[PDB]
Design a protein around this ligand. Structure first.
Ligand SMILES: [Zn+2]
Length: 234
C-alpha cells in the first residue's frame, strides 16, 4: 500500500550536486501555472494534454502542455472541465509533431472543477510541519480552494514559503544537505518526494518535475504534511 520512508542512503545530497541550485529554486519561488475551468484543446504524445492558458504575470506563454503518467489519465481528463496548478519549465519543453505565443510544459496538476470546492466558498488550510535534524522547529499553513487537491499544489506552496522563511534553496546551493516532503493521508497511506536535486553538475528540471506526472491528489481537509530536512554535516 504505502511507500516506506526514505532509507538513509537513498536521499539526494546537496553536497553531491555541483550544478546551480538556483535552477531548483526557480521551480518553486513564486512560480506556477494556474487556471480554472479549462478543457484541453490538443495533444502531442499519447499521455499529454495541451490547454490554452495565458501567463497573466510575465506574459511568457499562452499554451500549456501537461504530461501524465500514462494514456489512461490523459483520456480521463481530455474532455473534462478542469482546474490546473503546477510548476512549469521551458528548458527542453517540446511541442510539435511536425510544426504543431509562448509555450510552456509541466506534469500532472489537473483536477475536475465540478464538485471540488467548499460549500461555504471558503479556503482550506493545510498544516505543514517542518523538521530540522529530527526536531519540529516550525509549522505553517498553506491554503487551497480545492477539496481534492494535487500533492503538487501543496508541495509547491510549501516550498515557496520555505524558500523565503528558511532559504530552502539559494542560487549556489542549499543550507540543507538532505530533504523530503512526506504526505500522510487519513486512510493511512503515505508517500514522499525528495526535495534535493540528483547528484551531478547539471540539474534537469524536466526530469525532476516528472515525479508529479501521476497527478496524485489528496483530501485537503484531512491530509497531513511533514517536511524533513537535515544539515547533518555542516
Ligand atoms: Zn474549480
Amino acid at each position: 500500500e504505502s511507500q516506506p520512508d526514505p532509507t538513509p542512503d537513498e536521499l539526494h545530497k546537496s553536497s553531491e550536486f555541483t550544478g546551480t541550485m538556483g535552477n531548483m529554486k526557480y521551480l518553486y519561488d513564486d512560480h506556477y501555472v494556474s487556471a480554472t475551468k479549462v478543457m484541453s484543446v490538443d495533444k502531442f504524445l499519447a499521455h499529454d494534454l495541451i490547454y490554452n492558458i495565458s501567463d497573466k504575470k510575465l506574459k511568457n506563454y499562452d499554451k500549456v502542455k501537461t504530461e501524465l503518467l500514462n494514456e489512461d489519465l490523459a483520456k480521463k481528463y481530455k474532455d473534462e472541465v478542469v482546474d490546473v496548478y503546477g510548476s512549469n519549465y521551458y528548458v527542453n519543453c517540446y511541442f510539435s509533431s511536425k510544426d504543431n505565443g509562448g509555450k510552456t510544459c509541466m506534469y500532472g496538476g489537473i483536477t475536475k472543477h465540478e464538485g471540488n470546492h467548499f460549500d461555504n466558498g471558503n479556503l482550506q488550510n493545510v498544516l505543514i510541519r517542518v523538521y530540522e535534524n529530527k526536531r519540529n522547529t516550525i509549522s505553517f499553513e498553506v491554503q487551497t480552494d480545492k477539496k481534492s487537491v494535487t500533492a503538487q499544489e501543496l508541495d509547491i506552496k510549501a516550498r515557496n514559503f520555505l524558500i523565503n522563511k528558511k532559504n530552502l534553496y539559494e542560487f549556489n546551493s542549499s543550507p540543507y544537505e538532505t530533504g523530503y516532503i512526506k504526505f500522510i493521508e487519513n486512510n493511512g497511506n503515505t508517500f514522499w518526494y525528495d526535495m534535493m536535486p540528483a547528484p551531478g553538475d547539471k540539474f534537469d528540471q524536466s526530469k525532476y518535475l516528472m515525479m508529479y506526472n501521476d497527478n496524485k491528489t489528496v483530501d485537503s481537509k484531512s491530509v497531513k504534511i511533514e517536511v524533513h530536512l537535515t544539515t547533518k554535516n555542516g
